[PDB]
Design a protein around this ligand. Structure first.
Ligand SMILES: CCCCCCCCCCCCCCCCCC(=O)OC[C@H](COP(=O)([O-])OCC(O)COP(=O)([O-])OC[C@@H](COC(=O)CCCCCCCCCCCCCCCCC)OC(=O)CCCCCCCCCCCCCCCCC)OC(=O)CCCCCCCCCCCCCCCCC
Ligand SMILES: CCCCCCCCCCCCCCCCCC(=O)OC[C@H](COP(=O)([O-])OCC(O)COP(=O)([O-])OC[C@@H](COC(=O)CCCCCCCCCCCCCCCCC)OC(=O)CCCCCCCCCCCCCCCCC)OC(=O)CCCCCCCCCCCCCCCCC
Ligand SMILES: CCCCCCCCCCCCCCCCCC(=O)O[C@@H](COC(=O)CCCCCCCCCCCCCCC)COP(=O)(O)OC[C@H](O)CO
Ligand SMILES: CCCCCCCCCCCCCCCCCC(=O)O[C@@H](COC(=O)CCCCCCCCCCCCCCC)COP(=O)(O)OC[C@H](O)CO
Ligand SMILES: CCCCCCCCCCCCCCCCCC(=O)O[C@@H](COC(=O)CCCCCCCCCCCCCCC)COP(=O)(O)OC[C@H](O)CO
Lengths: 519, 521, 521
């Protein structure tokens, strides 16, 4: 296919504008980001918080309805991936960097400071509200988007694009018109900013880790961590060949290293306490699910707005911005699966992986805090993991391994996001241009680095603010995608013979009633 | 022309007239009896109300989710005679309107200011959740049960449009025409009269408060209430005896338009952002606390929630059970040809969402005022809350008048609809009843409401609530039996006969086989 | 023929326990305490997690397509009427345990509170009593009974725990060493769970005799006499070769339990109990997942001892009872569907337990609130009679409760012994009466051994040894889930579609790999 320049040029111009604003005009960019966060949070926290749970309800009911039997492909089709392989391939979609960053920080900071409507030093609350942001809502969003693309491209044979999934609502004219172009541009921009958030978190934490081992300098975030991890691997893996064979190796190394780190912290750490937190975390998450889903700026006597902006609305925006990439990824590896099976796997397997990960790491941190040891230290979120690792025997080698894992996650996430963006910018071609992929990867890495540099001391806050503002337009795209998906599922070939009969009988009944009214 | 059911008219008419005379000429005796009867009823049946109120919700969810959800309310492969949008629009009628207007400000504001048993004061989430508790799912679960029973009896099986006909599976045709069916219909008419009189009394009281606030009348004297009720009853009487159904549908459209206008005015001129924040908060805290409130009895809070329960939750239970004949028959009428699952889902969810939005807007504005220093509580009279809320907003002087007009139109339309259903139930389930019987029933409900308001005196809302609870207690058992009748009716469907006969035959064979095996050794 | 390879190890372990307990009491008690500490600290997480995984698993199995499978031949209707089947679920379950903890558990939760909650809270006191007795125990029993019933009726295998693992180990492991190990573990777990029940019954009977002033004070010789008398009546019933006396006792169990519950209901605070019914159910559904998430590091690392005393003990007790109740449920529930079986087994005993605990615990808590108090010296065994004597006419009801405990002793012994004889007779339903008598005597001896060894801390001894003996069978019950899923998936009604899916998926994988290789060009 050809390049959709009408969709590349707008998004690329927006990205260049954001980068120039952040780099050359740090103060103005930071002020604007703070003001836009204030306005967006105050005026649309209701939208984020309401539709986060509407997505979960919607995907659950879609799975449990008659559409669950539909198969993503030809009728009576069987899937191309084994169930074990299908489950394993979902690891590459999850947050390697997000988990590596927040596994220790989030449960520990919620244990220490508490959350709105709750007191400090509550393990159940800490683990439950860590599981709130990471288990069902993100993967309900991802299931919705991936199911939309899967039904559009496999069942109906349309192009693999976000705009195509809206064909039921806006028709073909809209899909090829200005509205389809707008949807595709918003998808590309949201993916860019959502991936740049992860790249910024990973670079920040890698710098902190290098400082922990005492091998770092000050400008390493810009001069080494970003540009090296981008150029020396991602470009040479993309531009050199269609498949560089390094992405597969790194995607397997991610699994191996994450398993090794989790097993180290599990065995060397307080194993019994972690095993106690498994059922405790799951039970206290299921108990507090709706209480946390109803936490708005009007909660805790109006004092929850700042916390929600810093913690919950940030995650809403982050997951919404991830939606296009993760949806395309899940759709690509789920052909032939049924809708019910797809939804169940996508919702539950990563939820369990996240639950276990947070159990190990947050539980070790909370147990240390309870005993008297404090991995908190200064309080930086990027230094908690290495403090936790160093607190355990043989922690130096594992800290180095954690830095290696962070670098591999950086490379893998950037490469996969660039692949999906290139596909979306090339009229839905599965194998997009290599140079378009490299350009989009450069753009994402540059945006993440620019957010970090503009934030400076408050790098994390600047990152979160720009992610929150950048994902506001795509929240409505996902909301309308729910409607488009329902309208597409209803108008399935298997249901048309029943729908015509229902329409005919309803018309007969309505005309009979109208005639009786005339009488 | 179905003959008049005099044997069902007289037992309910005599009770209504006895209540009117007793409450008018003997205000003190009537109030004392109502108070004592509330004490006894609440003490010895709050467990029944609270348990079966949630059993209704569970029963409806199970019925929709079970194999019965695919059955059509009519002949097989039938289709609805109303478009889905028209069905949803018609659902708004037969709701409260007057209850929603009366309580939208008062109830969440009251819970926020004073708290609820087992919880502390100044809790927005708890106030909104326990307001949603009384107005969203258990109400419409009860209405779905009754309307589904009536719809199945009348469309699928082709019986009369009655509540006794829904008990045929339990007591049979002889029972339906026997004394038990007559008793069920009498209780249905009594419950309709008292559930309607409660809303009419609330509307008259709030219109009096509005006239007092608008300065049209200096005070809301008893004669003011009498005049309001007389004028509104005269309007309803003219609408009915005129024999033309155009004016009533015009007033229904006006009710929808004016309710939307008031909601939009408070949403826009009020704290829009807080109103929108309270939507997810209200829903989440409702689903979080659902079973905590479902398990709230007089034994909660170390045995101290009895007075609060009788004031709010048991009163609502009685009110929503008293409405059950009217709202059930209304929903049954407009739901021809729908499947059981579709009927249940729409009836449960659409009104719940509308109530959620209404309470969010009005209660959230009141609570936002409370938090910011302003207090529309004033003297604390419930009837004066709404006009305190509107008069605290720019341009609200005219919207208070619009609120009074909306209350008047709600009064007229609700009286007409309830009286139409009552006339149906007193004429062997005729779809259209005699004009004079409908007029008489509507005037009787108005007279009961006026009697309650006047006998209450300085405490009118309390007397209204007490009489509502006492009058609705008998029909809780009718609804409970209707659950069994509905299950038996759905089980004995034509599509399920062959499978059931196969199972019965095989079961007899297996039982004789095991009896023989025991005989062996 | 006797499976001596299974009898001899179980007999050796049981006799070793008896010799250790009587001969060396200090050593036995020290080992029991140390083993309780170790197993609790290291596997309370396993107990707590899998107790709720069982509920999730059985609910999902009932909901899924497997719920349509019929236990037996296709179109085979059940042998017992639904009334008979429902009533037969009372013989299997817990009568002695219910009588022992009917008052003690809610009363002590109300008095002392539970981890993460304040004391003197009726809602939690009843919700966490319902937690330990309603859905987790019966989820375990339903899983085990369903596995046994499917293996023995659908597939025609022998009625054993070993034959239910055939999906995982083939007939080679079913008859190999692993099947023998599973059978031995099932026998030992049944012996020790039934011994825990019998020891509780003997303690309660001694407490009742002390209360009735028949004995001046309890003594070890009194417990020995009680256990000897009851097991002698048992041995006579078993060796007599006539089950008429046992059927009489099993009916007397229901009659007397219903009589006692109705007495406490009518003569106790009826309205408070009725209030507690919906309160208990609602607070159970509200707090279900908060109680399911209670671990050794809840309430700031202070719930370990409370969990070991209450929650982990009940988990171990149910897991040790699971072979018996599973075999019982499989025997009486042939021809049922998986969905019907699961729903009935989960819901009927849960409702019965809810009513029982509502009555007795609500009576105790209402006495505590009003000013009275049945706590007395704090002994768990003395609470029930302390509750009875507080009510008028309780002097006779104390002896009625003692008689009921004796009948429960005999009948529970006989059902457990019959299951053990079936296990040791290669799954033969008509178990040898001498093996049955030997197993019953061994159970009584183990219960007496735990009581005597514990002495003053008799209940602690019982619970410690029960947890230790039930720890091994937890993994068997966990593996039953996988074995049952493999049984159900590989069913004749699904094998054709499974073959079609396998072939199509192989074609799809071949296409994808060939396409990838082609594109790799
Ligand atoms: C924590 C919370 C938890 C909550 C959990 C919630 C979870 C939900 C689970 C959902 C599961 C669904 C699964 C089953 C689906 C099966 C349905 C189906 O299709 O079966 C056929 C079944 C029957 O079919 P039918 O007989 O043909 O029906 C006729 C159609 O109704 C009449 O035809 P039509 O005119 O509609 O035709 C239009 C056509 C296609 O439409 C078009 O013509 C499209 C035109 C193009 C528009 C542009 C689209 C492109 C936009 C993309 C986004 C871009 C953004 C970019 C951003 C840029 C920023 C810079 O659409 C359709 O195909 C019909 C579906 C329309 C759905 C309408 C529902 C509106 C909901 C309103 C309430 C909620 C709003 C929330 C507001 C927020 C605050 C609360 O369909 C229906 O169910 C239809 C009825 C649906 C309900 C209608 C409701 C009307 C208004 C309700 C208001 C009152 C209630 C709300 C609360 C109270 C407010 C006061
Ligand atoms: C105090 C509160 C509780 C405290 C907490 C404790 C928990 C409560 C204990 C519950 C324990 C579990 C259940 C045990 C019951 C076992 C028996 C049974 O019903 O199962 C066998 C049941 C019947 O089988 P069967 O015994 O073989 O029947 C044929 C025999 O030939 C039988 O031969 P037959 O045909 O001659 O049998 C007689 C009858 C056919 O049925 C019978 O066998 C007799 C009636 C059945 C007993 C029902 C027990 C279970 C339900 C509890 C009732 C209350 C709440 C639920 C309401 C019912 C909705 C299903 O047929 C007739 O000829 C009609 C005779 C008249 C019937 C009664 C009519 C009067 C109703 C009473 C109320 C009226 C006014 C006073 C109001 C009261 C003051 C508060 O078998 C089935 O499974 C059939 C299923 C039918 C369709 C299922 C779909 C509907 C279910 C919806 C879900 C409900 C949600 C509720 C959840 C709420 C949670 C908060
Ligand atoms: C320790 C680290 C790892 C832990 C990870 C946890 C893993 C859990 C993942 C759950 C399974 C995901 C993969 C499922 C693939 C197989 C298909 C499947 O399970 O779904 C079927 C769904 O089948 C059903 O019909 C519904 C069955 C319900 C199964 C529910 C199991 C999950 C229950 C979750 C409980 C709550 C968990 C905690 C939530 C936070 C498929 O339906 P179908 O349309 O193909 O029809 C098949 C058949 O005809 C039956 O329909
Ligand atoms: C919250 C506001 C935003 C909502 C966004 C919705 C986005 C999707 C829109 C898709 C268009 C259709 C919307 C209306 C759907 C109604 C439900 C529905 O269709 O249910 C189907 C699937 O049903 C389900 O499994 C459940 C449906 C969803 C309802 C459950 C929602 C739970 C919400 C509870 C909230 C708490 C209550 C108080 C607060 C409101 C089938 O049932 P039916 O009635 O259409 O047909 C029945 C029969 O087969 C004949 O057709
Ligand atoms: C604690 C008190 C008891 C529990 C109360 C809460 C219960 C909530 C959940 C109840 C779920 C019941 C769902 C029933 C769906 C039936 C589905 C169906 O089509 O039937 C199948 C499953 O069948 C069943 O299991 C039928 C059981 C239905 C009865 C359910 C009773 C609910 C509880 C009643 C007591 C309520 C007490 C409330 C007061 C506290 C087919 O199986 P079968 O062919 O063997 O069934 C034969 C039957 O005649 C077919 O209709």
């Amino acid at each position: 296919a050809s390049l959709n320049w009408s969709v590349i040029v707008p998004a690329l111009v927006i990205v260049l504008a954001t980068v120039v604003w952040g780099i050359g005009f740090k103060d103005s960019f930071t002020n604007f980001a703070s003001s836009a966060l204030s306005a967006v949070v105050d005026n649309l926290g209701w939208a984020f918080i309401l539709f986060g749970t509407v997505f979960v309800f919607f995907i659950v009911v879609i799975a449990a309805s008659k559409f669950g039997t539909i198969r993503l492909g030809r009728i009576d089709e069987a899937p191309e991936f084994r169930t074990v392989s299908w489950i394993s391939m979902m690891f590459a979609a999850g947050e390697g960097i997000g988990l590596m960053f927040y596994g220790t920080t989030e449960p520990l900071t919620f244990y220490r400071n508490g959350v709105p409507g709750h007191d400090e030093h509550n393990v159940g609350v800490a683990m439950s509200t860590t599981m709130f942001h990471w288990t069902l809502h993100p993967w309900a969003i991802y299931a919705i988007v991936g199911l939309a693309i899967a039904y559009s491209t496999f069942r109906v044979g349309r192009k693999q694009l976000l705009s195509s999934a809206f064909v039921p609502l806006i028709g073909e004219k809209g899909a090829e018109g200005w509205l389809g172009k707008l949807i595709d541009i918003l998808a590309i921009i949201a993916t860019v900013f959502g991936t740049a958030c992860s790249l910024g978190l990973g670079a920040l934490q890698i710098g902190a880790g290098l400082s922990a081992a005492n091998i770092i300098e000050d400008p390493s975030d810009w001069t080494i961590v970003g540009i090296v991890s981008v150029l020396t691997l991602a470009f040479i893996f993309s531009a050199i060949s269609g498949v560089g064979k390094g992405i597969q190796y790194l995607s397997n190394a991610n699994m191996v290293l994450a398993a090794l780190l989790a097993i180290f912290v599990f065995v060397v750490g307080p194993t019994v306490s972690i095993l106690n937190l498994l059922p405790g975390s799951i039970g206290n998450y299921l108990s507090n699910f709706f209480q946390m889903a109803g936490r708005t700026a009007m909660s805790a006597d109006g004092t929850a707005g700042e916390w929600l902006g810093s913690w919950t609305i940030f995650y809403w925006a982050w997951w919404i911005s991830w939606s296009p990439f993760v949806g395309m990824f899940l759709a690509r590896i789920s052909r032939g699966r049924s809708i019910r099976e797809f939804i169940l796997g996508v919702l539950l397997v990563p939820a369990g992986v996240s639950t276990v990960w947070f159990s190990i790491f947050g539980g070790t941190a909370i147990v240390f805090e309870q005993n008297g040891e404090s991995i908190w230290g200064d309080g930086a979120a990027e230094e908690q993991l290495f403090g936790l690792l160093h607190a355990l025997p043989g922690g130096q080698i594992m800290g180095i391994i954690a830095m290696i894992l962070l670098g591999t996650f950086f490379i893998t996430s950037a490469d996969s996001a660039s692949t999906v963006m290139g596909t979306m910018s090339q009229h839905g071609q599965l194998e997009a241009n290599k140079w378009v992929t490299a350009a989009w990867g450069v753009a994402t890495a540059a945006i993440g680095l620019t957010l970090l540099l503009s934030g400076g001391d408050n790098a994390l806050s600047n990152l979160q603010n720009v992610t929150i503002v950048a994902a506001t337009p795509f929240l409505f795209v996902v909301i309308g995608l729910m409607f488009a998906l329902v309208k597409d599922l209803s108008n399935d070939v298997i249901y048309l013979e029943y729908r015509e009969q229902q329409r005919f009988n309803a018309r007969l009944a309505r005309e009979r009633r109208v005639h009786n009214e005339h009488r």
